[PDB]
Design a protein around this ligand. Structure first.
Ligand SMILES: [Cl-]
Ligand SMILES: [Cl-]
Ligand SMILES: [Cl-]
Length: 196
């Protein structure tokens, strides 16, 4: 077919991938959509194919036509095994998705606690503001449900040093957002971090 590495990647077919890679052509060849084979594997959470492609030098920061990269997408989706691989193989922690967010912001949004922990530890900037005017902290409050995972993510962000006073575009602070929603645990965490 036209793009056999991409199909092999979609299928997690690592014997076929091994054979194609032995031909010594460009690992990041684009298919008809502009996607790399590693991007195809990552969208599918095909851990084994992603590992083989990454070890062979596929660029974890190459982008597709919606500004996803393997690193960015694995972080947003909580595909933590692939994400860890990307972090060991050149993830650009300053890179941003189509919303202008780091990988950390969607991980927080979606309540992916261990992905948040991992990204904090790696050094993603906790104070980054996306093109919705939101930080990881703001999204965890506004787009979470105030429970369990989101309390844990708030706590992680604040202990790591996220500024609790970085407000949304309209000047509404994390503290006000928590108060408006009656999120008492998150309010208390914010106040001890110096929120106003
Ligand atoms: Cl996973
Ligand atoms: Cl984002
Ligand atoms: Cl997670």
């Amino acid at each position: 077919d036209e793009y056999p590495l991409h199909m092999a990647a979609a299928n997690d077919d690592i014997q076929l991938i091994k054979h194609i890679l032995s031909q010594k052509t460009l690992i990041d060849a684009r298919d008809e959509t502009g996607s790399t084979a590693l991007m195809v594997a990552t969208r599918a959470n095909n851990i084994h194919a992603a590992h083989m492609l990454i070890e062979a030098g596929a660029d974890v920061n190459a982008k597709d036509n919606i500004q996803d990269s393997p690193y960015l997408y694995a972080g947003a989706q909580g595909y933590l095994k692939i994400l860890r691989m990307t972090l060991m193989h050149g993830a650009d922690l300053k890179s941003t998705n189509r919303y202008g967010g780091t990988a950390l912001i969607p991980a927080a949004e979606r309540g992916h606690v261990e992905t948040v922990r991992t990204l904090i530890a790696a050094g993603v900037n906790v104070n980054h503001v996306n093109n919705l005017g939101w930080t990881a902290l703001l999204e965890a409050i506004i787009l979470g449900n105030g429970k369990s995972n989101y309390q844990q993510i708030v706590a992680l962000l604040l202990k790591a040093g996220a500024n609790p006073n970085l407000a949304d575009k309209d000047g509404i602070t994390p503290l006000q957002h928590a108060r408006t929603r009656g999120y008492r645990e998150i309010e208390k965490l914010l106040l001890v971090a110096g929120a106003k």
